[PDB]
Amino acid sequence: EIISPHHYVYPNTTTLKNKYGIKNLNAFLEKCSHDTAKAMINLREESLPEYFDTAYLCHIHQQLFKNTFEWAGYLRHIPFTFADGTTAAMPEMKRTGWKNAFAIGDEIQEGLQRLDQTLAEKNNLQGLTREEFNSEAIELFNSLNQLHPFREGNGRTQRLFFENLAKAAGHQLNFSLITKERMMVASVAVAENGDLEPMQHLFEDISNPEKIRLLKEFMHTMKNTGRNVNDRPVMVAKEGETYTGTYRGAGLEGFALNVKGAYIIGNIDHLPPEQLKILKPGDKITFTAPK
């Protein structure tokens, strides 16, 4: 048809039409990644907006991808005509039938106008406790996660939207301290089970100052190591729960385990003083976080 999802990509490829003219997928992805890293640096320095609505969501997307996509500010249900003449739109997404689905067509607008509406009626979640803010914020995050408003680049723009929302609301949400892996698990959990717990967990680690400092310290130890932890899920141990794995060492404020490819961080004071002594890197340890 005249308006098609296939018009987003270069013919006989899967690599999105972009301002660099790069048809090769890996060449494009590197350039997109390099340029959008630069845009983040500047977006973080701009003043927080007076209103948190979809217009602001779009501004973040527009500013991140202004040098990459001609449709930088654009929601995916709106027909977009490129400089090349072809018109693109993707109201479907399409998963396999057995997977959970994203929004289709007019639902995008409905769902986005709904977010706009609740952030207006609740004054950007502004006069709230952490518990209240988080509880309301998770609902909106998940709602926006299933709307999948842009053809691409949802993750970054969504994380910045919510980090800035938190800050304006008198609270914190350091998504910087969350790997691409953890987000995915937490997202998939909501989409399939309706299980909020991994996201509740995620938001808690990222907002509770006592858990921020623990993660901050651990993420520092990854700097200049030559590694990438972004494939690996990192967490602070849930209260009450019991983890068992191999000891990756201690710091001033906290320590780290390895549990089936995942890094669980704990407060150093929650260790029995006497274990802390004779614990060399590699030791198998079981650890139950306290109340």
Ligand SMILES: [Cl-]
């Ligand atoms: Cl993204």
Ligand code: NI
């Ligand atoms: Ni066509």
Ligand code: NI
């Ligand atoms: Ni450059």
